[PDB]
């Protein structure tokens, strides 16, 4: 780089799981009904609370619980996150399934909902296998994260000349809690995202998953994706990553390629969560 503070974005991962035990009772119960099948997806809904991160927290806790499983149809001050569990009843099939290929389909998913609403590219998969007997739990969470093409990074410095904006962005989120992004209209109002008018105003906010200081949420490989297929001239452009708490901040940012010779592109999917060892593996959980 050559101007000062410029660096390339870095990421924190989206989400942490929070499942209690009554996650996995409601678990232990469904199963009882589709022991002949060897493997179900079934959806869940989980309500972020983007408020009232912990401290200790480096991003949005996602809490699973029995309710999970079932159809929310209303909660105070909160933004509704659709994902699902891939319960598998043959633990070797759990073991053995090819880990990446199967982010990378749900990621395939997230990216073709993308493409139609940004605001639609953002989900999360548990896979399980659940040992009755034992009452132990097998469980890993995939957040699909997809940089396309895979060799664009986003290179940003500060833009504090923006942080006026921050409080109705923060505002603007909250009333329209379906949505993950919005943008400036000609005029400097925010307003939803609109490709056409994107790529004449250049000026887009997310609304992030994250709490590190000058680290947004892996999310925003997402979003950023959808924006480059959605106007593939843009190369500079400004971005605000909005929290609920101080931590906003704006940047001037470039997009570039570090391959000369990628086409145009490659799908680099990522979003396994690590283990409390630190590791990219299940976490288990003996509940007896």
Not at 30 to 58: E, F, G, M, R
Not at 97 to 113: G, M, P, S, Y
Not at 253 to 276: C, H, L, Y
């Amino acid at each position: 780089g050559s101007m000062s503070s410029e660096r390339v974005l870095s990421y924190a991962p989206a989400f942490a799981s929070a499942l209690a035990t009554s996650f996995f009772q409601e678990l232990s119960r469904l199963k009882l009904d589709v022991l002949k099948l060897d493997s179900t997806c079934q959806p869940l809904t989980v309500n972020l609370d983007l408020h009232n991160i912990p401290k200790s927290a480096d991003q949005v806790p996602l809490f699973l619980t029995n309710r999970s499983f079932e159809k929310h149809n209303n909660r105070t001050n909160e933004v509704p996150l659709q994902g699902s569990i891939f319960n598998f009843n043959v633990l070797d099939e759990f073991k053995n399934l090819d880990k990446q290929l199967f982010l990378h389909q749900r990621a395939l998913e997230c990216w073709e909902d993308g493409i139609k609403d940004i605001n639609k590219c953002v989900s999360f998969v548990i896979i399980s296998f659940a040992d009755l007997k034992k009452y132990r739990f097998y469980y890993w969470l995939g957040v699909p994260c997809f940089q396309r093409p895979s060799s664009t990074v986003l290179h940003v410095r500060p833009e504090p000349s923006l942080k006026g904006l921050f409080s109705k962005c923060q505002k603007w989120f909250d009333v329209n809690y379906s949505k993950w992004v919005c943008i400036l209209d000609a005029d400097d109002e925010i307003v939803n995202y609109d490709k056409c008018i994107i790529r004449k105003t250049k000026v887009l906010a997310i609304r992030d998953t994250s709490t590190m200081e000058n680290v947004p949420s892996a999310l925003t490989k997402n979003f950023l994706s959808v924006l480059q297929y959605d106007v593939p001239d843009l190369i500079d452009f400004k971005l605000l990553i909005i929290r609920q708490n101080e931590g906003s901040f704006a940047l001037n940012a470039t997009f570039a390629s570090i391959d000369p010779q990628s086409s145009s592109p490659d799908m680099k999917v990522s979003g396994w969560e690590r283990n409390v060892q630190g590791k990219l593996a299940p976490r288990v959980v003996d509940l007896s």
